[PDB]
Symmetry: C2
Amino acid sequence: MGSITENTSWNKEFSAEAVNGVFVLCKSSSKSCATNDLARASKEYLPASTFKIPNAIIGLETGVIKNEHQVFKWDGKPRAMKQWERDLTLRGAIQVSAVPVFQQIAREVGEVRMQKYLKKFSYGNQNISGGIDKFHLEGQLRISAVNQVEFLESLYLNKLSASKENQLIVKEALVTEAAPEYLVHSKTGFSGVGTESNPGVAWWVGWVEKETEVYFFAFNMDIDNESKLPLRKSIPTKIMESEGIIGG
Amino acid sequence: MGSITENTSWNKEFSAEAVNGVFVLCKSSSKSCATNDLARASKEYLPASTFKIPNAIIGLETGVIKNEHQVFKWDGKPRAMKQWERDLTLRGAIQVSAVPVFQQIAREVGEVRMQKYLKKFSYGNQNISGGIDKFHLEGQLRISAVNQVEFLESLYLNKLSASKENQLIVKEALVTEAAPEYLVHSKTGFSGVGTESNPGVAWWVGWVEKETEVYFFAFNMDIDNESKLPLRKSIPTKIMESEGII
């Protein structure tokens, strides 16, 4: 991005919910970003399930994921969530953030190839230690809100070191809201509830194609109570509504 | 396509509205489809703005449309609807059905290439008589709901004579509803009102990707009054809701 500025007026949406967090919002045409908190926008957190984005791309590139119509079959064995115990498309596996599906993808990719792609994508601190299947969730990988929007911008422009076809496939799998004036592409993440003194993190990252403009966004918050999880969409949604971007 | 089977339980959605029309729905593939009217399912009509689907693909294949982020700039001159009087992306032009954007694309494609691709796509009667920029609106081009679902299935499967890349670009531009469990890709068409004795046609065609299943659909109806237009979505939406698809 070209520039960033602090805009403390969005803070009302955070303080109304007693939330500690950050929103980064970038306008494509101007290359300019605004955040409520410049310091936090640069702080690096576990990507949790937002890692499913580069994971999906890498799985495609390596041929671990065959094509966009790949069905990931439930093997029948009891999974960690009820919603994962079923056959899933790529979009399906992305949306229920099916840990087991993506853990298997990452296993098949392997450390060497995973590290190569993460380096090429300039994705986070690029540190993959703690298990080839658990590094993003309870291992060492860390990424900032600013790095999330830069990465998503490169994905939007097909600029990642991956085929255009594979980036297109992932971009469509990420569609989460369609309106006549705008398309929202997005991904949630949630590391867990941590402790009160060491909270977990919740994310919502993505971009809005709005008429001929595009807006890149990344939100994160401290979270110690699963009841607060819906705020990870509601705060950035209210901000984007107030910005005249969505709602619409 | 494969086989088409009459489903009389859908008639009530048409008679409740005094609508003459057809719904074709195919689960997994066009190998077997269901319909309310066997004769009408294969009857061919002006495609009107449903033609924007092949037009967008052909525009991309020929390089007339540079890439997926091309912006179609408004020149400031009057266009037939106010919603077309602005710069538009490919998705934008599709979603608002920006006739003049697609007319200029068609002119640049030209008749020879246009004909070639309609043949490759088996798009309806493949007849482009009537003017390069209007054959789909007032000319001789005709396509049936059965053929719409075959064409959409080929697009879905990236089996059209076009790059996978350009088929994906057009598919994304067609997304009209996103939910956790499904994605709807769709396109409307409306030829006009004609007369009582020679009505226009209204269309709604597309596919639903639900869980690990896919449903191809095509709807058309006779229309002679513009106030009836919302029915081209509500009739098929009601049918698909009752089937538990959406």
